Specification:
The complex is a heterotetramer, with two copies of chain A (231 residues) and two copies of chain B (324 residues). By secondary structure, chain A is α/β, with parallel strands linked by helices. Chain A contains nine helices and nine strands. Chain A has one domain: P-loop containing nucleotide triphosphate hydrolases (Rossmann fold), CATH 3.40.50. The chains are: A alpha/beta (231), B mainly alpha (324). It is classed as transport protein/hydrolase.
Chain lengths: 231, 324, 231, 324
């Protein structure tokens, strides 16, 4: 069940010593204030950054994984990325698919996130909320268990950025549908009610250290929240 | 295969066709003009065998290669730096190969065969290209890179001007023609350079996968399993190679590596599997024309390719700015 | 009481014909999906854009107001603005004050939004959440009734951007304290529970037209929300 | 007054002092070295009246003014285009004056007085600065503006080169000294231009408020009650003025409008109430040295001021890129 394991992870003061478990078929939310390490953590779990600590992904440790294979077992979404100039949304998405074949699936995901009419339009020409959905879409197509058997982990850093209540709900359905298929979804929570309502487990970093973990309902308690935010 | 895709591919194949034609047409025209005319028929005439074969042909083939190269280079650099403004000339990679050449010549000897020099040019380019990329990693910015590049360009101009004056083995002409590019003294005795271009040109034109990825952007590129560092350095080398040779062959030509790439993107060629090949063709033809005009323009002397390329370049660039 | 009046405002299809009232001492939230006109509207009420419709600000119509005076009666905060290169936070804020004298007040606001230690640092060198607070701060100092008697309206387009639950709560206190002093605060709501919990009145645009208005509790009803978002 | 504020102001006054000194220290040095050295005392000798008063002084005064101008200009442009890379030389406002200047010299050779020329240059600048600003409003981008500028620069260089060859009243030297700037032929007979620089120089150097605002950025600048259009257009003029005249005075000098401003920000001169004066002072001194060096380094021929400023420029710019 446990797909990823974090053993005393921490790089400089931003991210203090932290350890935990990433259980498949579950949605984990990194909860905490600004500076609390959330992004840095995610970057590690992804494999974008190296350093002090030990992370093992589905048996072998990240460090042991080859880029190529890693990309088949997990997808990463940075907090923000500059859209590639002159590149049609449909190409953007395709490039993310490990099986260009499954063309119809692309249309489905693009649809789900209101992008069927946006395909064919150059990424550098989308609005804020648009680009985001385009990115999410691209990442999902990459790791959907439907098209990719090796898909196991989906790391998302601040996904709801630019989305409206609706576009949010939209992605909620996708993510759920994803963990229901056995995917491991780890994302940095933005709204507490949200995390309470949709997350499964939930680490609560602060200053860079983990004040708590476990079921979101237990972890998101006034004592902790106060210990974390100060109110 | 997706709908829009197959459709785009169709229009792509069309252009690669149209461009493929335009080049031959240009290849022909070039082989036929030079202050006198020599139609295909009058080619095997004691004149044709001289001009057409011993003078024109070589020169034309040089142009084609340098064009397609400078063009592709522009595409390649742009991808690497994640910036459309990336190009050999602006970033001073050409002046890099410039310095590397003059240096090889002076600190060397008039006996340095071309191949020897070309290698020194490639070095000049590589240095700059490497330094630019260093500045590209520590501080990824479109302004930074565009700033640095320009700067290194200037710095390389100094070293060049300051070394030629010192030796005095200078010729106000040779200098200007090199600084502003020109295929005036291109003979078969430089056919080793021309060949040298063919390998890379072909190889790189097939490496589209790495660039569509690369184009997505570092992280995306990486998280997608791309061997970034490899391809970055690899392309850095490929660039240095092409550019360096190009400078050695015809000096600092500019404004085909920026424009050509983009114009083709405008037409719809975006997927590198097409943009690279397209670039070569459009880059060849483009420079051929410039060259033809460069020589036929005035009878007194042969206008520096650069002057032409930059004269037509700036305009087509301004427009491209408003259009995009 | 009514400070601003909107009479059949609308520029192209983004913003359809819309009319309403801005009552002082109250917090109005522009609620709606992406594209629903919210930003365009705010830009008008501010005076940044001109067009079809009629907006009167405290008697005289906007169009009649002089830039100078307008800046004393209202402050505007665009959705996003590129931080001025080489400019110390403290200077940034000062420039916004109509009375450079009230130096202590600056320190207070900067403090409230956790920026007392950030002053003196160049704006171009702040983090996301930092710059935002720096901007909000700057805007507040400009229209606080404490230092400025002519302050009447504070227009904010997506303020909570980049702020964490805490920094949010932080600004909530400031805004409240502001309308309590009789200020008119109009901002584009991001979270419905928030708008319900903190807003007074609330227009609910959609497609560009106003589906509703009035007390946030009445306006934020399932029938309308569904009519607006589609869920 | 805020603490951090009072302190900064102090250190600022400190620099305005040191800089105020260095300039004089440079004004002196300029008047003493030309070809042969001299001494403040050995000045009041029959020789001094010649050199020191009828040759040197005039020149050293033009340098100051042109220097303090180009420096301020860049400052101003950067404010307007909300971009650090905004500068006369790069964006081509200098070549703008170039075109306009030559236009006169050709339509009325020797008939049109220097002052008559100055106006023609000021026009050349204004145009470009306007065309640039237009492109700035319709598509605010640091890349766009920095692109268009480079382009227009080229276009203007073409118009110039092409118009000179045609008339044949060309002198490979005159052309190069202009394109690469130089104070070689500055006599008291151009003092009308020199004076024409003081008014604006003093004025614009006092309009700090408008620019601090302006610096916040369009919207912020506006919503705060700033007459944006006015000040935008006003500075555009003040720019073309200084720029054009400087060109009519010493051709196209480049790379002081970019560096000097930023360096002073590094020292902590940010409030335009200081950055302007600071620019004037650091601008003047900076160019004096550049001139002095251009004056001694090669006894056979005086170096084009441009080359100097550029040689030292590119480097100090690269460094600035790593520091900032």
């Amino acid at each position: 069940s446990i797909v990823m394991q974090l053993q005393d992870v921490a790089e400089s003061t931003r991210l203090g010593p932290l350890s935990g478990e990433v259980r498949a078929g579950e949605i984990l939310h990194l909860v905490g204030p600004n500076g609390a390490g959330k992004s840095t953590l995610l970057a590690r779990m992804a494999g974008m950054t190296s350093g002090k600590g030990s992370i093992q992904f589905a048996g072998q440790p990240l460090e042991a994984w080859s880029a190529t294979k890693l990309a088949l077992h997990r997808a990463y979404l940075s907090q923000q990325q500059t859209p590639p100039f002159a590149t049609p949304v449909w190409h953007y998405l395709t490039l993310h698919q490990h099986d260009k074949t499954r063309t119809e699936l692309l249309n489905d995901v693009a649809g789900a996130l209101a992008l069927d009419d946006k395909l064919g339009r150059s990424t550098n020409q989308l609005s804020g909320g648009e680009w985001q959905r385009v990115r999410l879409a691209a990442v999902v197509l990459q790791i959907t268990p439907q098209a990719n058997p090796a898909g196991q982990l989906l790391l998302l850093d601040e996904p709801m950025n630019s989305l409206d209540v609706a576009q949010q709900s939209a992605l909620d359905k996708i993510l759920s549908a994803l963990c229901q298929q056995g995917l491991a979804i780890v994302m940095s929570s933005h709204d507490l009610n949200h995390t309470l309502r949709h997350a499964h487990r939930a680490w609560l970093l602060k200053g860079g250290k983990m004040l708590a973990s476990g079921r979101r309902e237990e972890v998101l308690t006034p004592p902790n929240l106060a210990q974390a935010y100060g109110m | 295969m997706l709908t829009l895709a197959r459709q785009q591919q169709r229009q792509n194949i069309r252009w690669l066709l149209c461009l493929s034609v335009l080049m031959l047409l240009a290849l022909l025209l070039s082989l036929c003009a030079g202050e006198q005319w020599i139609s295909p028929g009058d080619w095997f005439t004691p004149r044709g065998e001289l001009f057409v074969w011993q003078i024109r042909l070589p020169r034309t083939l040089a142009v084609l290669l340098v064009g397609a190269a400078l063009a592709i280079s522009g595409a390649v650099m742009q991808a690497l730096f994640e910036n459309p403004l990336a190009e050999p000339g602006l970033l001073g990679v050409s002046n890099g190969a410039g310095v590397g050449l003059i240096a090889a010549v002076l600190l060397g000897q008039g006996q340095l065969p071309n191949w020897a020099l070309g290698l020194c040019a490639i070095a000049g380019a590589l240095i700059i290209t490497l330094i630019l990329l260093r500045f590209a990693r520590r501080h990824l910015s479109t302004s930074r890179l565009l700033l640095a590049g320009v700067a290194l360009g200037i710095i390389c101009s100094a070293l060049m001007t300051w070394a030629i004056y010192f030796s005095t083995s200078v010729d106000l002409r040779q200098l200007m023609y090199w600084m502003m590019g020109g295929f005036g003294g291109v003979d078969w005795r430089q056919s080793w350079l021309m060949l040298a271009l063919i390998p890379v040109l072909l190889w790189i034109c097939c490496q589209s996968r790495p660039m569509n990825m690369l184009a997505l952007g570092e992280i995306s590129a990486r998280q997608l399993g791309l061997p970034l560092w490899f391809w970055r350095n690899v392309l850095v080398a490929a660039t240095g190679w092409m550019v360096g040779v190009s400078v050695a062959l015809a000096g600092a030509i500019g404004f085909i590596g920026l424009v050509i790439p983009h114009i083709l993107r405008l037409c719809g060629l975006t997927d590198h599997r097409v943009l690279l090949p397209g670039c070569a063709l459009a880059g060849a033809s483009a420079l051929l024309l410039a060259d033809i005009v460069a020589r036929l323009a005035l009878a007194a002397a042969e206008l520096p390719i650069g002057v032409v390329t930059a004269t037509l370049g700036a305009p087509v660039f301004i427009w491209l700015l408003l259009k995009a």
